[PDB]
Nucleic acid binder design. Structure first.
Ligand code: NA
Length: 90
DNA sequence: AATAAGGAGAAGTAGG
DNA sequence: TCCTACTTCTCCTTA
């Protein structure tokens, strides 16, 4: 089953939800969620996973923060902005 | 107040 | 047994 960071990277590569998520600096692997349209993307994650409850941006962000230590995704000090590791991108 | 992003400890679920 | 990789719930902080 797909991991959250890979779901996000795949969306960014396919362009299927361009109004919910986008690259900020492609070279650096930084990306940003839409304030008004991120919930539709969260919903899609939960459905893809088959989770019992409806997924929310808050629960998705709780999972994203757990990558901070291992480094796949790190929060950037800009609104709604995160960064993939070079390993994840490579 | 209302809204929103950011945060995390604790406990539950999935699939090894 | 006991960890993975989240999910869900609840409450706190800052803007
Ligand atoms: Na929010």
């Amino acid at each position: 089953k797909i991991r959250l960071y890979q779901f996000l990277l795949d969306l960014l590569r396919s362009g299927d939800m361009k109004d919910s998520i986008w690259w900020v600096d492609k070279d650096k692997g930084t990306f940003q969620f839409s304030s008004k349209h991120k919930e539709a993307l969260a919903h899609r994650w939960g459905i893809q996973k088959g989770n019992r409850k409806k997924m929310t941006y808050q629960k998705m962000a709780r999972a994203l923060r757990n990558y901070g230590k291992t480094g796949e995704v790190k929060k950037v000090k800009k609104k709604l902005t995160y960064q993939f590791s070079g390993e994840v991108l490579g």
